[PDB]
Amino acid sequence: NTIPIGIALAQTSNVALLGQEQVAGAKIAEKYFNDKGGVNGTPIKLIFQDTAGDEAGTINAFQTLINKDKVVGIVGPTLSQQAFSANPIAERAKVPVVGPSNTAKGIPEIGDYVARVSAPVSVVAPNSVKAALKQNPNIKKVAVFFAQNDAFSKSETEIFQQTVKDQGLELVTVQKFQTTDTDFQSQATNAINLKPDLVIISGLAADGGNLVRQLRELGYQGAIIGGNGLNTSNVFAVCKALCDGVLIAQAYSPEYTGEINKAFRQAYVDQYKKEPPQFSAQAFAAVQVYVESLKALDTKNKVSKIQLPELRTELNKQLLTGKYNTPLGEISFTPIGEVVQKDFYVAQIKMEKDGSQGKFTFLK
Numbered sequence: 001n002t003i004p005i006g007i008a009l010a011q012t013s014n015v016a017l018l019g020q021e022q023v024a025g026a027k028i029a030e031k032y033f034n035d036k037g038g039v040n041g042t043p044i045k046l047i048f049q050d051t052a053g054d055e056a057g058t059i060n061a062f063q064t065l066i067n068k069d070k071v072v073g074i075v076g077p078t079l080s081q082q083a084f085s086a087n088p089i090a091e092r093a094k095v096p097v098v099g100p101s102n103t104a105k106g107i108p109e110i111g112d113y114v115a116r117v118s119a120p121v122s123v124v125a126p127n128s129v130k131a132a133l134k135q136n137p138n139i140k141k142v143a144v145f146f147a148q149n150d151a152f153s154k155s156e157t158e159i160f161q162q163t164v165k166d167q168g169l170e171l172v173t174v175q176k177f178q179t180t181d182t183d184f185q186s187q188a189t190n191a192i193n194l195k196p197d198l199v200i201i202s203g204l205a206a207d208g209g210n211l212v213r214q215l216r217e218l219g220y221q222g223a224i225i226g227g228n229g230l231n232t233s234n235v236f237a238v239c240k241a242l243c244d245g246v247l248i249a250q251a252y253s254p255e256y257t258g259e260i261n262k263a264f265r266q267a268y269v270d271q272y273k274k275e276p277p278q279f280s281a282q283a284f285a286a287v288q289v290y291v292e293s294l295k296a297l298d299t300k301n302k303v304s305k306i307q308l309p310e311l312r313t314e315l316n317k318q319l320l321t322g323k324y325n326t327p328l329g330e331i332s333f334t335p336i337g338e339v340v341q342k343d344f345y346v347a348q349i350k351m352e353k354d355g356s357q358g359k360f361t362f363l364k
């Protein structure tokens, strides 16, 4: 007998360029927590249902997890674009959802059953602009690009644009693209003709990486910031050596000295031979929230004796009150499910000259 927790992430489609890291983090959490006895001796069982890359797939995944798999709660989905469409299904059904990577404005406000462990664009993104200005105090002109079909990208670009304004910089253009585009020659050239000193990109991984590469090919030599959708080594394959120097804000640091991070990092590094990415740590934290909440609930109200609808409602109520020492640091929730998290960072892509290997270097 086990306690089923649903994992609804993009395991297929180009969105899996981000989802792959989350699956890895979730599996690490499953072993970590089950090795400690699961929920007071009862193991958890992660049940994975692929959302693919769109809203319909996420709705189907959620409905399958809720109705067929009988899960006590869901971790997911990968994208805010998917969450805005699918989370209301879980809200209506009174099934908790914890978002591992949904950073758009308005996610926790979807309802009383929606929380997130992923710090939002408003708190994460401005730091990368400040980092760019530290490395080059003479930045004056900024070109901004965003994916106009993606909810997160639209939310993120608004924060980047406001930050540019607040730092006293000139916004020379805002260019739009679609996440499904591969060619950005017209937008890139339009921007390059305005002689920007800094370029900011809000997109996802494949699109973001292709845009970075094309900007460099077209002769752009200035600074580049990528938003959260570019925050994966899976962009290295796409831009290769031309990824070098891209700044991306982080809501996680491998070097964070919390005991559970040391354990998580060690487990990740031993397996994957590189530092754990943000998305992996955030997915781990989402699973942790469920395990620790299930433990606290079970101690007060033995879960094996609670029928599923009440179990879900009590689990939701419990998780919102909890304090968690996670790889992300000490986190908690506001009464509407917003994450409370103190520390943020900025990392910079460092490519080896041959372009076949790279890493994220954290700025001090």
Ligand SMILES: CC[C@H](C)C(=O)C(=O)O
Pocket: 018, 078, 079, 080, 081, 101, 102, 103, 104, 152, 204, 228, 229
């Ligand atoms: C995977 C992270 C994703 C791009 C995000 O931040 C969001 O959709 O809100």
Ligand SMILES: [Mg+2]
Pocket: 107, 108, 109, 110, 111, 112, 113, 114, 115, 336, 337, 338
């Ligand atoms: Mg909420």
